[PDB]
Amino acid sequence: NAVTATQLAAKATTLYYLHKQAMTDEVSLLLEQALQLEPYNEAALSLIANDHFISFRFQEAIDTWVLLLDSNDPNLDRVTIIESINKAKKLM
């Protein structure tokens, strides 16, 4: 019935990328709500990490990705996430 965490994170993602990649209160709240429903939501944590990365906060990007890796979702693309961590690590 209700909107899913991924659907909330998808709206957050649209408002983010199409609007100057700003973490506004609106984007942050949609993400918070995705993570209230699913604490390890891939779409949500991935936006947060990417936003850190884009902002050159490489340590915080890594922390978010490492947190995402603790997901128990068998389908999680760990490979791409760890490539992201590795890039970030090299830019620090």
Side-chain angles (χ1 to χ4, degrees), residues 2-92:
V3 178
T4 63
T6 303
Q7 287 171 342
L8 293 175
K11 191 174 176 170
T13 302
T14 299
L15 297 158
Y16 185 85
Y17 285 107
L18 260 78
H19 306 267
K20 300 188 163 152
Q21 302 75 51
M23 192 50 58
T24 63
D25 294 344
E26 186 178 21
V27 170
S28 307
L29 187 57
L30 284 160
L31 293 173
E32 279 176 18
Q33 292 297 112
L35 297 172
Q36 179 63 37
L37 292 174
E38 291 179 29
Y40 293 91
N41 188 269
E42 189 162 5
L45 288 181
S46 163
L47 187 61
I48 290 162
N50 286 349
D51 175 63
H52 285 313
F53 185 93
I54 286 171
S55 302
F56 281 32
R57 297 185 303 261
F58 295 118
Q59 172 84 259
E60 295 169 63
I62 297 167
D63 290 346
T64 312
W65 283 316
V66 172
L67 183 68
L68 178 49
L69 291 174
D70 215 31
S71 185
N72 263 6
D73 175 1
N75 306 320
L76 185 71
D77 187 1
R78 276 170 201 270
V79 175
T80 301
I81 290 169
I82 296 163
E83 288 170 342
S84 298
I85 284 167
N86 242 246
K87 199 172 184 80
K89 179 165 90 182
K90 285 174 194 173
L91 291 171
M92 288 178 332

XYZ file of all heavy atoms in Angstrom, unseen atoms left out:
727
model
N 0.828 -1.255 0.000
C 0.000 0.000 0.000
C 0.852 1.291 0.000
O 0.911 2.020 -1.012
C -1.018 -0.004 1.192
N 1.509 1.564 1.128
C 2.296 2.785 1.278
C 3.499 2.837 0.332
O 3.963 1.813 -0.186
C 2.725 2.988 2.733
N 3.967 4.057 0.097
C 5.180 4.326 -0.656
C 6.357 3.574 -0.015
O 6.449 3.455 1.192
C 5.407 5.867 -0.706
C 6.660 6.226 -1.429
C 4.220 6.538 -1.391
N 7.245 3.032 -0.825
C 8.349 2.263 -0.271
C 9.527 3.197 0.012
O 9.544 4.328 -0.472
C 8.767 1.141 -1.208
O 9.244 1.718 -2.424
C 7.563 0.215 -1.502
N 10.487 2.719 0.802
C 11.690 3.480 1.132
C 12.449 3.868 -0.136
O 12.995 4.978 -0.242
C 12.582 2.674 2.070
N 12.478 2.943 -1.094
C 13.167 3.154 -2.365
C 12.445 4.208 -3.196
O 13.085 5.044 -3.812
C 13.359 1.814 -3.136
O 14.076 0.883 -2.304
C 14.156 2.030 -4.428
N 11.111 4.207 -3.165
C 10.338 5.259 -3.820
C 10.563 6.660 -3.211
O 10.636 7.646 -3.933
C 8.853 4.883 -3.877
C 8.596 3.769 -4.904
C 7.201 3.183 -4.872
O 6.457 3.323 -3.895
N 6.841 2.488 -5.956
N 10.664 6.735 -1.886
C 11.023 7.966 -1.194
C 12.442 8.436 -1.588
O 12.656 9.616 -1.875
C 10.889 7.767 0.330
C 9.449 7.545 0.880
C 9.491 7.252 2.376
C 8.558 8.724 0.625
N 13.387 7.500 -1.651
C 14.767 7.805 -2.012
C 14.859 8.191 -3.464
O 15.688 9.020 -3.815
C 15.652 6.640 -1.748
N 14.011 7.605 -4.313
C 13.989 7.978 -5.725
C 13.499 9.424 -5.906
O 14.035 10.168 -6.730
C 13.121 6.997 -6.548
N 12.481 9.848 -5.161
C 12.092 11.251 -5.281
C 13.228 12.124 -4.784
O 13.568 13.126 -5.424
C 10.794 11.600 -4.553
C 10.298 13.012 -4.948
C 8.933 13.370 -4.367
C 8.597 14.800 -4.725
N 7.210 15.158 -4.411
N 13.828 11.744 -3.657
C 14.958 12.534 -3.158
C 16.030 12.684 -4.228
O 16.595 13.766 -4.393
C 15.555 11.912 -1.909
N 16.313 11.600 -4.950
C 17.351 11.557 -5.982
C 16.974 12.498 -7.132
O 17.820 13.242 -7.629
C 17.528 10.120 -6.517
O 17.872 9.246 -5.438
C 18.603 10.042 -7.641
N 15.713 12.465 -7.565
C 15.260 13.385 -8.605
C 15.436 14.855 -8.178
O 15.995 15.658 -8.918
C 13.797 13.131 -9.016
O 13.670 11.805 -9.537
C 13.393 14.096 -10.099
N 14.958 15.201 -6.985
C 15.088 16.568 -6.493
C 16.548 16.988 -6.342
O 16.874 18.141 -6.605
C 14.360 16.762 -5.175
C 12.851 16.583 -5.175
C 12.488 16.285 -3.757
C 12.099 17.794 -5.703
N 17.416 16.052 -5.951
C 18.848 16.306 -5.852
C 19.537 16.616 -7.196
O 20.027 17.750 -7.382
C 19.559 15.116 -5.192
C 21.047 15.333 -4.945
C 21.484 15.983 -3.794
C 22.013 14.855 -5.843
C 22.842 16.151 -3.541
C 23.381 15.027 -5.608
C 23.788 15.689 -4.464
O 25.118 15.889 -4.202
N 19.634 15.596 -8.084
C 20.433 15.675 -9.371
C 19.937 16.690 -10.362
O 20.732 17.255 -11.164
C 20.616 14.317 -10.100
C 21.628 13.445 -9.394
C 21.220 12.326 -8.670
C 22.985 13.788 -9.372
C 22.136 11.539 -7.958
C 23.936 12.998 -8.670
C 23.490 11.878 -7.971
O 24.360 11.118 -7.269
N 18.631 16.907 -10.347
C 18.048 17.821 -11.333
C 18.070 19.258 -10.811
O 17.861 20.218 -11.587
C 16.649 17.364 -11.814
C 16.546 16.622 -13.171
C 16.977 15.164 -13.072
C 15.132 16.687 -13.705
N 18.353 19.411 -9.518
C 18.374 20.764 -8.888
C 19.690 21.139 -8.198
O 19.742 21.439 -7.010
C 17.156 20.978 -7.988
C 15.861 20.716 -8.690
N 15.145 21.708 -9.323
C 15.172 19.566 -8.889
C 14.058 21.186 -9.869
N 14.047 19.887 -9.615
N 20.744 21.133 -8.999
C 22.047 21.617 -8.598
C 22.712 20.761 -7.534
O 23.630 21.227 -6.877
C 21.961 23.086 -8.168
C 21.461 23.981 -9.289
C 21.557 25.468 -8.946
C 21.445 26.293 -10.220
N 20.868 27.650 -9.984
N 22.266 19.511 -7.390
C 22.901 18.560 -6.478
C 22.993 19.200 -5.081
O 24.076 19.264 -4.466
C 24.294 18.146 -6.994
C 24.289 17.522 -8.403
C 24.088 18.584 -9.503
O 24.795 19.612 -9.542
N 23.099 18.353 -10.370
N 21.862 19.748 -4.630
C 21.781 20.342 -3.293
C 21.027 19.408 -2.362
O 19.899 18.981 -2.664
C 21.083 21.716 -3.330
N 21.660 19.124 -1.230
C 21.057 18.420 -0.089
C 20.138 19.401 0.694
O 20.499 19.915 1.752
C 22.199 17.892 0.791
C 21.847 16.896 1.895
S 20.734 15.402 1.234
C 21.970 14.688 -0.194
N 18.985 19.724 0.123
C 18.023 20.654 0.759
C 17.325 19.949 1.913
O 17.431 18.728 2.044
C 16.942 21.092 -0.243
O 16.183 19.941 -0.644
C 17.576 21.736 -1.475
N 16.626 20.708 2.757
C 15.766 20.116 3.779
C 14.773 19.098 3.173
O 14.526 18.041 3.762
C 15.028 21.207 4.565
C 15.987 22.069 5.389
O 17.147 21.633 5.574
O 15.602 23.168 5.842
N 14.243 19.401 1.984
C 13.272 18.520 1.324
C 13.889 17.167 0.965
O 13.324 16.102 1.259
C 12.687 19.223 0.092
C 11.584 18.455 -0.580
C 10.977 19.177 -1.772
O 11.637 20.089 -2.340
O 9.844 18.819 -2.144
N 15.071 17.208 0.348
C 15.819 15.996 -0.005
C 16.193 15.233 1.262
O 16.026 14.022 1.315
C 17.105 16.330 -0.833
C 18.035 15.085 -1.010
C 16.736 16.906 -2.201
N 16.700 15.944 2.279
C 17.159 15.304 3.499
C 16.005 14.591 4.187
O 16.166 13.440 4.610
C 17.803 16.308 4.470
O 18.834 17.051 3.806
N 14.848 15.256 4.300
C 13.692 14.609 4.918
C 13.224 13.346 4.178
O 12.932 12.349 4.815
C 12.522 15.603 5.116
C 11.275 15.146 5.898
C 11.588 14.651 7.352
C 10.215 16.281 5.943
N 13.125 13.397 2.847
C 12.769 12.208 2.043
C 13.732 11.052 2.278
O 13.297 9.917 2.461
C 12.685 12.520 0.535
C 11.422 13.270 0.087
C 11.661 13.954 -1.254
C 10.197 12.359 -0.004
N 15.029 11.361 2.327
C 16.059 10.378 2.682
C 15.903 9.858 4.102
O 15.975 8.644 4.319
C 17.458 10.965 2.500
C 17.866 11.259 1.062
C 19.202 11.993 1.091
C 17.981 9.979 0.230
N 15.686 10.756 5.066
C 15.468 10.339 6.449
C 14.336 9.343 6.548
O 14.392 8.397 7.341
C 15.147 11.537 7.354
C 16.378 12.299 7.787
C 16.042 13.538 8.610
O 14.898 13.661 9.155
O 16.954 14.397 8.714
N 13.278 9.589 5.771
C 12.099 8.744 5.797
C 12.315 7.407 5.134
O 11.822 6.408 5.627
C 10.903 9.475 5.193
C 10.487 10.624 6.091
C 10.025 10.099 7.421
O 10.675 10.300 8.466
N 8.905 9.390 7.395
N 13.039 7.392 4.013
C 13.495 6.143 3.422
C 14.261 5.297 4.441
O 14.019 4.102 4.558
C 14.377 6.418 2.193
N 15.188 5.919 5.163
C 16.017 5.235 6.171
C 15.293 4.898 7.489
O 15.742 4.041 8.237
C 17.270 6.068 6.456
C 18.233 6.281 5.274
C 19.318 7.283 5.665
C 18.868 4.967 4.851
N 14.174 5.572 7.766
C 13.275 5.206 8.854
C 12.576 3.875 8.526
O 12.466 2.985 9.382
C 12.234 6.333 9.083
C 11.198 6.099 10.185
C 11.806 5.980 11.567
O 12.766 6.671 11.899
N 11.237 5.104 12.391
N 12.119 3.744 7.281
C 11.531 2.489 6.789
C 12.555 1.368 6.577
O 12.319 0.231 6.998
C 10.747 2.731 5.498
C 9.462 3.562 5.613
C 8.960 3.777 4.210
C 8.391 2.859 6.488
N 13.676 1.682 5.925
C 14.720 0.693 5.634
C 16.084 1.292 5.955
O 16.641 1.998 5.121
C 14.710 0.297 4.154
C 13.514 -0.510 3.673
C 13.598 -0.816 2.186
O 14.731 -0.918 1.659
O 12.541 -0.976 1.541
N 16.616 1.030 7.167
C 17.879 1.626 7.631
C 19.071 1.385 6.712
O 20.043 2.152 6.773
C 18.113 0.941 8.985
C 16.737 0.565 9.452
C 16.023 0.149 8.197
N 19.002 0.355 5.874
C 20.097 0.056 4.932
C 19.660 0.214 3.472
O 20.218 -0.396 2.561
C 20.728 -1.332 5.230
C 21.461 -1.339 6.559
C 20.804 -1.694 7.740
C 22.796 -0.924 6.639
C 21.466 -1.665 8.969
C 23.469 -0.882 7.858
C 22.799 -1.257 9.016
O 23.467 -1.222 10.223
N 18.657 1.059 3.253
C 18.171 1.289 1.904
C 19.301 1.738 0.975
O 20.004 2.702 1.263
C 17.046 2.305 1.885
C 16.412 2.408 0.539
O 16.825 3.224 -0.287
N 15.417 1.558 0.283
N 19.459 1.012 -0.129
C 20.555 1.205 -1.045
C 20.443 2.524 -1.762
O 21.396 3.261 -1.808
C 20.608 0.069 -2.070
C 21.909 0.095 -2.939
C 22.177 -1.257 -3.651
O 21.313 -2.180 -3.559
O 23.255 -1.382 -4.295
N 19.277 2.818 -2.329
C 19.064 4.094 -3.021
C 19.379 5.318 -2.128
O 20.012 6.265 -2.578
C 17.666 4.171 -3.579
N 18.942 5.271 -0.868
C 19.083 6.381 0.066
C 20.538 6.577 0.520
O 21.076 7.679 0.430
C 18.164 6.178 1.265
N 21.170 5.509 1.005
C 22.536 5.588 1.477
C 23.475 5.909 0.331
O 24.487 6.597 0.499
C 22.952 4.272 2.149
C 22.322 4.001 3.518
C 22.842 2.671 4.101
C 22.604 5.140 4.478
N 23.127 5.412 -0.842
C 23.915 5.674 -2.009
C 23.875 7.164 -2.411
O 24.918 7.752 -2.722
C 23.499 4.721 -3.140
O 23.961 5.221 -4.345
N 22.706 7.791 -2.360
C 22.636 9.244 -2.597
C 23.478 10.032 -1.586
O 24.197 10.966 -1.946
C 21.178 9.767 -2.591
C 20.976 11.242 -2.988
C 21.459 11.490 -4.409
C 19.508 11.742 -2.871
N 23.351 9.673 -0.315
C 24.082 10.341 0.756
C 25.606 10.238 0.545
O 26.333 11.261 0.638
C 23.649 9.773 2.140
C 22.196 10.206 2.479
C 24.649 10.190 3.268
C 21.507 9.353 3.586
N 26.082 9.022 0.267
C 27.523 8.777 -0.038
C 27.981 9.562 -1.251
O 29.059 10.123 -1.240
C 27.794 7.281 -0.288
N 27.180 9.544 -2.318
C 27.527 10.221 -3.550
C 27.598 11.698 -3.294
O 28.495 12.342 -3.783
C 26.480 9.946 -4.659
C 26.598 8.544 -5.231
O 27.565 7.847 -4.955
N 25.616 8.130 -6.053
N 26.643 12.236 -2.534
C 26.672 13.653 -2.190
C 27.948 14.059 -1.417
O 28.558 15.095 -1.704
C 25.426 14.051 -1.381
C 25.485 15.504 -0.914
O 25.509 16.391 -1.785
O 25.508 15.765 0.320
N 28.325 13.267 -0.410
C 29.624 13.437 0.248
C 30.765 13.445 -0.793
O 31.595 14.346 -0.817
C 29.836 12.311 1.270
C 29.030 12.467 2.525
N 28.951 13.661 3.218
C 28.292 11.572 3.232
C 28.198 13.492 4.302
N 27.783 12.237 4.325
N 30.785 12.447 -1.671
C 31.885 12.298 -2.617
C 32.027 13.547 -3.512
O 33.125 14.092 -3.664
C 31.669 11.039 -3.461
C 32.810 10.727 -4.400
C 33.834 9.868 -4.007
C 32.845 11.285 -5.686
C 34.920 9.568 -4.880
C 33.929 10.983 -6.578
C 34.947 10.118 -6.159
N 30.908 13.943 -4.122
C 30.776 15.135 -4.967
C 31.278 16.383 -4.219
O 31.864 17.303 -4.820
C 29.242 15.324 -5.311
C 28.790 14.284 -6.336
C 28.903 16.751 -5.777
C 27.235 14.276 -6.548
N 31.028 16.405 -2.905
C 31.386 17.519 -2.065
C 32.832 17.393 -1.557
O 33.256 18.208 -0.757
C 30.402 17.584 -0.883
O 29.069 17.709 -1.373
N 33.559 16.362 -2.013
C 34.966 16.128 -1.642
C 35.115 15.734 -0.148
O 36.198 15.818 0.423
C 35.850 17.346 -2.028
C 36.225 17.410 -3.508
C 35.374 16.927 -4.500
C 37.438 17.957 -3.900
C 35.728 16.970 -5.860
C 37.804 18.029 -5.271
C 36.946 17.534 -6.241
N 34.010 15.317 0.480
C 34.050 14.759 1.827
C 34.272 13.262 1.690
O 33.352 12.466 1.875
C 32.767 15.076 2.619
C 32.560 16.583 2.855
C 31.367 16.872 3.723
N 30.139 16.308 3.171
C 29.236 17.000 2.478
N 29.422 18.295 2.235
N 28.140 16.399 2.032
N 35.506 12.879 1.357
C 35.792 11.504 0.944
C 35.673 10.523 2.114
O 35.229 9.390 1.949
C 37.182 11.422 0.248
C 37.239 12.200 -1.050
C 38.115 13.274 -1.206
C 36.350 11.889 -2.103
C 38.108 14.024 -2.385
C 36.351 12.617 -3.295
C 37.243 13.678 -3.447
N 36.075 10.965 3.292
C 35.974 10.143 4.506
C 34.521 9.809 4.832
O 34.182 8.650 5.100
C 36.622 10.851 5.697
C 36.373 10.111 7.003
C 37.369 9.000 7.241
O 37.068 7.824 7.022
N 38.566 9.368 7.706
N 33.666 10.831 4.814
C 32.254 10.623 5.069
C 31.574 9.780 4.013
O 30.698 9.015 4.353
C 31.539 11.960 5.248
C 32.071 12.646 6.483
C 31.642 14.069 6.617
O 30.415 14.301 6.747
O 32.546 14.949 6.628
N 31.973 9.931 2.738
C 31.498 9.041 1.667
C 31.807 7.578 1.986
O 30.938 6.714 1.895
C 32.101 9.449 0.306
N 33.050 7.308 2.384
C 33.484 5.951 2.730
C 32.678 5.390 3.893
O 32.197 4.252 3.827
C 35.010 5.871 3.007
C 35.799 6.232 1.741
C 35.422 4.451 3.482
C 37.275 6.475 1.991
N 32.509 6.199 4.936
C 31.769 5.795 6.131
C 30.349 5.358 5.767
O 29.826 4.424 6.349
C 31.685 6.957 7.127
C 33.030 7.286 7.760
O 33.963 6.479 7.651
O 33.164 8.374 8.348
N 29.739 6.071 4.824
C 28.359 5.784 4.390
C 28.332 4.483 3.582
O 27.438 3.661 3.757
C 27.764 6.950 3.559
O 28.003 8.189 4.238
C 26.265 6.764 3.360
N 29.312 4.307 2.708
C 29.415 3.075 1.908
C 29.725 1.861 2.781
O 29.195 0.782 2.541
C 30.458 3.218 0.789
C 29.984 4.014 -0.400
C 28.743 3.916 -1.035
C 30.724 5.023 -1.120
N 28.689 4.813 -2.095
C 29.882 5.495 -2.171
C 32.016 5.558 -0.990
C 30.296 6.503 -3.086
C 32.432 6.547 -1.879
C 31.564 7.026 -2.917
N 30.570 2.039 3.797
C 30.938 0.935 4.674
C 29.705 0.514 5.497
O 29.480 -0.673 5.720
C 32.150 1.288 5.567
C 32.408 0.178 6.630
C 33.410 1.502 4.724
N 28.905 1.496 5.907
C 27.629 1.270 6.569
C 26.653 0.520 5.646
O 26.035 -0.454 6.052
C 27.029 2.601 7.077
C 25.714 2.518 7.862
C 25.882 1.838 9.239
C 25.087 3.897 8.057
N 26.556 0.951 4.400
C 25.726 0.256 3.410
C 26.140 -1.216 3.244
O 25.279 -2.088 3.110
C 25.766 0.997 2.058
C 24.993 0.412 0.861
C 23.527 0.046 1.230
C 25.031 1.386 -0.298
N 27.448 -1.486 3.263
C 27.972 -2.845 3.107
C 27.479 -3.796 4.194
O 27.495 -5.010 3.996
C 29.506 -2.844 3.054
C 30.144 -2.223 1.795
C 31.704 -2.134 1.922
C 29.748 -3.057 0.577
N 27.055 -3.257 5.336
C 26.535 -4.110 6.423
C 25.111 -4.602 6.152
O 24.583 -5.422 6.914
C 26.641 -3.443 7.805
C 26.948 -4.442 8.885
O 27.640 -5.439 8.568
O 26.494 -4.275 10.041
N 24.506 -4.104 5.066
C 23.240 -4.622 4.546
C 23.264 -6.141 4.390
O 24.261 -6.714 3.956
C 22.929 -4.025 3.180
O 21.641 -4.440 2.735
N 22.147 -6.773 4.741
C 21.981 -8.215 4.605
C 21.295 -8.584 3.287
O 20.941 -9.753 3.072
C 21.194 -8.784 5.804
C 22.103 -9.355 6.894
O 23.330 -9.237 6.836
N 21.497 -9.989 7.887
N 21.100 -7.588 2.416
C 20.475 -7.816 1.118
C 21.454 -8.538 0.200
O 22.491 -7.972 -0.168
C 19.974 -6.510 0.478
C 19.420 -6.713 -0.949
O 19.389 -7.858 -1.460
O 19.009 -5.718 -1.579
N 21.118 -9.789 -0.181
C 21.991 -10.614 -1.015
C 22.282 -9.986 -2.375
O 23.347 -10.218 -2.933
C 21.183 -11.914 -1.197
C 20.213 -11.916 -0.091
C 19.863 -10.492 0.148
N 21.346 -9.186 -2.885
C 21.477 -8.553 -4.206
C 22.326 -7.261 -4.248
O 22.616 -6.743 -5.336
C 20.090 -8.289 -4.813
C 19.213 -9.533 -4.862
O 19.677 -10.645 -5.159
N 17.928 -9.348 -4.570
N 22.720 -6.747 -3.084
C 23.588 -5.538 -3.011
C 24.839 -5.654 -3.889
O 25.593 -6.629 -3.780
C 24.012 -5.259 -1.565
C 24.816 -3.986 -1.243
C 23.931 -2.781 -1.387
C 25.386 -4.028 0.170
N 25.076 -4.645 -4.732
C 26.268 -4.618 -5.583
C 27.466 -4.120 -4.780
O 27.871 -2.948 -4.881
C 26.068 -3.742 -6.837
C 27.234 -3.838 -7.806
O 28.189 -4.593 -7.520
O 27.201 -3.162 -8.861
N 28.033 -5.037 -4.007
C 29.159 -4.765 -3.134
C 30.363 -4.379 -3.930
O 31.133 -3.539 -3.491
C 29.495 -5.993 -2.283
C 28.646 -6.073 -1.056
C 28.776 -7.386 -0.304
N 27.575 -7.485 0.504
C 27.461 -7.020 1.745
N 28.520 -6.496 2.371
N 26.287 -7.106 2.359
N 30.528 -5.002 -5.095
C 31.660 -4.713 -5.957
C 31.742 -3.218 -6.323
O 32.781 -2.599 -6.148
C 31.721 -5.645 -7.193
C 32.859 -5.231 -8.146
C 31.947 -7.099 -6.762
N 30.636 -2.631 -6.774
C 30.644 -1.213 -7.182
C 30.890 -0.340 -5.976
O 31.658 0.617 -6.049
C 29.347 -0.802 -7.920
O 29.206 -1.626 -9.078
C 29.409 0.658 -8.378
N 30.265 -0.690 -4.856
C 30.416 0.070 -3.616
C 31.884 0.104 -3.174
O 32.414 1.152 -2.828
C 29.521 -0.508 -2.528
C 28.047 -0.219 -2.869
C 29.878 0.068 -1.149
C 27.037 -1.002 -1.974
N 32.538 -1.047 -3.202
C 33.936 -1.123 -2.772
C 34.902 -0.428 -3.771
O 35.942 0.088 -3.355
C 34.348 -2.576 -2.491
C 33.541 -3.141 -1.309
C 35.860 -2.700 -2.200
C 33.592 -4.640 -1.254
N 34.568 -0.436 -5.067
C 35.299 0.381 -6.044
C 35.166 1.891 -5.723
O 36.144 2.650 -5.839
C 34.845 0.064 -7.489
C 35.341 -1.359 -8.006
C 34.709 -1.823 -9.337
O 33.646 -1.277 -9.743
O 35.284 -2.745 -9.980
N 33.969 2.311 -5.310
C 33.736 3.683 -4.861
C 34.587 4.036 -3.634
O 35.187 5.130 -3.586
C 32.259 3.922 -4.559
O 31.482 3.743 -5.737
N 34.612 3.126 -2.654
C 35.404 3.302 -1.434
C 36.854 3.464 -1.830
O 37.564 4.358 -1.326
C 35.261 2.091 -0.470
C 33.907 2.140 0.252
C 36.458 2.007 0.545
C 33.549 0.867 0.968
N 37.305 2.595 -2.727
C 38.688 2.654 -3.142
C 39.110 3.940 -3.864
O 40.186 4.456 -3.602
C 39.066 1.433 -3.960
C 40.129 0.636 -3.293
O 41.258 0.534 -3.807
N 39.819 0.111 -2.097
N 38.271 4.428 -4.774
C 38.477 5.722 -5.409
C 38.584 6.843 -4.337
O 39.538 7.606 -4.332
C 37.323 5.997 -6.408
C 37.592 7.059 -7.464
C 36.421 7.077 -8.512
C 36.647 8.053 -9.682
N 37.552 7.615 -10.830
N 37.582 6.930 -3.460
C 37.534 7.927 -2.369
C 38.802 7.920 -1.507
O 39.405 8.963 -1.244
C 36.310 7.707 -1.515
N 39.208 6.724 -1.111
C 40.400 6.489 -0.297
C 41.635 7.071 -0.987
O 42.458 7.698 -0.348
C 40.537 4.975 -0.099
C 41.708 4.495 0.680
C 41.491 3.021 1.085
C 42.034 2.043 0.038
N 41.755 0.624 0.441
N 41.737 6.881 -2.303
C 42.864 7.380 -3.084
C 42.834 8.899 -3.270
O 43.828 9.479 -3.625
C 42.885 6.709 -4.454
C 43.382 5.252 -4.475
C 43.174 4.716 -5.898
C 43.292 3.207 -6.022
N 42.903 2.840 -7.429
N 41.691 9.535 -3.028
C 41.573 10.971 -3.216
C 41.753 11.729 -1.910
O 41.801 12.959 -1.910
C 40.221 11.335 -3.859
C 40.091 10.893 -5.321
C 38.679 11.097 -5.782
C 41.151 11.591 -6.236
N 41.803 10.986 -0.805
C 42.024 11.604 0.492
C 43.452 12.038 0.683
O 43.668 12.909 1.486
C 41.644 10.672 1.619
C 40.177 10.488 1.737
S 39.770 9.246 3.147
C 41.337 8.076 3.228
